[PDB]
């Protein structure tokens, strides 16, 4: 009796313990194997090139997109096997292939330098720290707080909304302070540009930074 | 349809296609063109192109 029924109890414990100890090492090896595969494909993908950047303007024909590149001009460019051309809206900004041009993908949501002007952290400036200018606060709200809140009122007057605001006067009188305080409360996306940031250097730096 | 031409002249217009500006049409089969970098090139004219610029 105690050979067939004894080995499958006194040594089955050992084989099951060994199976579990092997299982943990199998998981540990698989981690390193997936990791080394990752690193190998990492090296291999570090062998193509940037293929620069371009912007689509017209899909003149399937497989023949008109694009405009960053440094240079405009070209006719095809797309990779994904070839979802009708997904490509103009000015989407896209990633090409390096040579024979050709297109790699569509890239995520467009803007890069232009993104810098958008105000990430709104300043602490608040209307409660401006004195007297309350009338000017209302005259700025009628072009800022009213239209973004009540286009229905403009329709109920049937008139077109005002296009913009010019703050002028003596230097050091609060227009900067009002701008900062407005950044704190409009809660729409706030973007700011120094006047001297524009035109700048190299042709198009005036074109690009406005367009 | 024009698959024979698609097999010939589409290959002649081997992608990609650069874009520039013409300035001289001196030869009926060679013109002189400008491009983005501002360089100037005396280049041949392929017969399928429109006779207008």
């Amino acid at each position: 009796r105690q050979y067939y029924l004894s080995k499958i109890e006194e040594l089955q414990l050992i084989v099951n313990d060994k199976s579990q100890n092997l299982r943990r090492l199998q998981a540990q090896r698989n981690e390193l194997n997936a990791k080394v595969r990752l690193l190998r494909e990492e090296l291999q993908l570090l062998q193509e090139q940037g293929s620069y950047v371009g912007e689509v303007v017209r899909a003149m024909d399937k497989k023949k997109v008109l694009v405009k590149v960053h440094p240079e001009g405009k070209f006719v460019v095809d797309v990779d096997k994904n070839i979802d051309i009708n997904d490509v809206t103009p000015n989407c900004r896209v990633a090409l292939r390096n040579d024979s041009y050709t297109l790699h993908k569509i890239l995520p949501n467009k803007v890069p330098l232009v993104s810098l002007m958008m105000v990430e952290k709104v300043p602490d400036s608040t209307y409660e720290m401006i004195g007297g200018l309350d009338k000017q606060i209302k005259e700025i709200k009628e072009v800022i707080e009213l239209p973004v809140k009540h286009p229905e009122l403009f329709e109920a007057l049937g008139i077109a909304q005002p296009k913009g605001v010019l703050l002028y006067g003596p230097p050091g009188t609060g227009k900067t302070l009002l701008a900062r305080a407005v950044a704190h409360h409009t809660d729409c996306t706030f973007i700011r540009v120094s006047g001297s940031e524009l035109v700048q250097k190299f042709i198009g730096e005036g074109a690009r930074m406005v367009r | 349809k024009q698959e024979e031409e698609r097999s010939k002249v589409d290959d002649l217009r081997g992608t990609p296609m650069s874009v520039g500006t013409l300035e001289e049409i001196i030869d009926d089969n060679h013109a002189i063109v400008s491009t983005s970098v501002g360089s100037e090139h005396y280049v041949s004219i392929l017969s399928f192109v429109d006779k207008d610029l």
Partner: peptide, 24 residues
């Protein structure tokens, strides 16, 4: 249908042969 974007090109009877390919 797709729209043409002012690409030109003449009809087939007016171009190619081996002449253009050899010239290029």
């Amino acid at each position: 249908g797709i729209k043409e974007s002012d690409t030109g090109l003449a009809p087939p009877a007016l171009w190619d042969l081996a002449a253009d390919k050899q010239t290029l």
